[PDB]
Amino acid sequence: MTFEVDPMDEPTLLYLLFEVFDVVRVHQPHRGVIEAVYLRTPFSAGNA
């Protein structure tokens, strides 16, 4: 991607977002046991 913006005077950042699907499934098998399974599909983040 090439951005052409402007001749600003101060240093600036290009804050860019990539829309993804970040979800979580929450298992609670037994009392005091909670497990979460995260998932981001475009920017992979593992099934931790």
Next chain:
Amino acid sequence: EVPFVPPRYMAPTEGRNSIRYSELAPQYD
């Protein structure tokens, strides 16, 4: 009788011993 040639299946590429990072092929042992 014709010879009995059992098929040769490839090992599970997603099995127990498998250390997988998303981007690349899974390391195995």
